[PDB]
Structure formats: C-alpha cells, structure tokens
Design an enzyme around this catalytic site. Sequence first.
Site, PDB file in Angstrom:
ATOM      1  N   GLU A  11       1.910   9.454   7.854  1.00 35.67           N
ATOM      2  CA  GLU A  11       2.424   9.486   6.477  1.00 35.67           C
ATOM      3  C   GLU A  11       3.941   9.445   6.389  1.00 35.67           C
ATOM      4  O   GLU A  11       4.480   9.099   5.345  1.00 35.67           O
ATOM      5  CB  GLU A  11       1.909  10.738   5.755  1.00 35.67           C
ATOM      6  CG  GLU A  11       0.384  10.800   5.642  1.00 35.67           C
ATOM      7  CD  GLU A  11      -0.234   9.802   4.646  1.00 35.67           C
ATOM      8  OE1 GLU A  11       0.506   9.074   3.907  1.00 35.67           O
ATOM      9  OE2 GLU A  11      -1.480   9.761   4.575  1.00 35.67           O
ATOM     10  N   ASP A  20       3.599   4.791  -2.464  1.00 33.60           N
ATOM     11  CA  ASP A  20       2.811   4.716  -1.256  1.00 33.60           C
ATOM     12  C   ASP A  20       2.347   3.281  -1.033  1.00 33.60           C
ATOM     13  O   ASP A  20       2.758   2.358  -1.755  1.00 33.60           O
ATOM     14  CB  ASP A  20       1.648   5.716  -1.272  1.00 33.60           C
ATOM     15  CG  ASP A  20       0.543   5.343  -2.233  1.00 33.60           C
ATOM     16  OD1 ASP A  20       0.615   4.292  -2.898  1.00 33.60           O
ATOM     17  OD2 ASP A  20      -0.437   6.121  -2.338  1.00 33.60           O
TER      18      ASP A  20
END
Length: 164
Positions: A11, A20
Amino acid sequence: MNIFEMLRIDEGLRLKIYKDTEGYYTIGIGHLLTKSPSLNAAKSELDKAIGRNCNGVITKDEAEKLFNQDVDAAVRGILRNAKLKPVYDSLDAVRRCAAINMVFQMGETGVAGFTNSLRMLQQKRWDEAAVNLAKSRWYNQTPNRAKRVITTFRTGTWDAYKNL
Ligand SMILES: CCCc1ccccc1
C-alpha cells in the site's frame, strides 16, 4: 515478515490525501476515505477518522493508527464471515497473511465471493488456487500485487516480498 510489513509494502505510505489505483480518495497506508468524487467529502471523512481538522494531511503516527484499525477490521471481517472463517482457520500463518491482504484490499463481501478459490485453498490445492485466483479483475487491474499475494498462497513463504 508479518501482515503489517506485507501491507506496508503493497500500500505504501502517503501522508496527504491521494487517489488509489481505482481513483478513490485515500490516505496513509491504504486507508480508503470515500468513493465519492468530492475531495471535500474525503476531507470530512478524514477529519472524522482522525478526530481533528486535518485539512487533508496527517502524521505518520496517525497513518499507523488507521492502519492498525484497518488490519484489525480485516481480520474481524474474516472471523465474522461464515464463508471466509473456515478457510482462514484451515490456513497456516503465512497464508493467513495473504488472506488478510486480499480482504484489506477488496473487503470481506468482495473476497467471500471468490468461491472456487476458497474451496481450492481449503483443500490445500495450492497451484490450482493460484491459477484460479489469477482469473480475476483483481489480478488484471493490480497484477504485480496480485502476483505477490498469489505466490504467497502458492508457496506458503514470503519469497515474493523478501526482496522488497
Ligand atoms: C480467495 C480467498 C482467500 C481467503 C480470504 C479470506 C479468508 C480465507 C481465504
């Protein structure tokens, strides 16, 4: 390696609101803020999550606190889900981390629909599970991350992460 190190690699860490891979406002270590296209909505969610007026920026400590909460939530989601829990309980510790990683990325309901892969994992048919897992929107949209998580399920080792 442990689940925190694994997801920190997958991440990253960003202290300002970012989008994202799906274009959704996120912060920290993959903490999704909202699927709304409104940055103002994301900032509101951020302030609610942190408990102060952040104006779109947090500290590393705050990012790590959200990450602890999010990992905790992923594990609880698995343990509360009647399709996921028995497969999770059947797995060894390394493969449990691959399971948590998927639920962290896609959410519990999402993963719980991977019916054929769940069965192959429960049966410990690892190469078959790995083949089935790659037949997915998940693999096609985030192939490098999916390949790492799949290798983890295939081998029960951290080989895909150790260089990272
Ligand atoms: C493809 C399903 C992987 C998984 C996820 C959560 C719990 C067990 C196995």
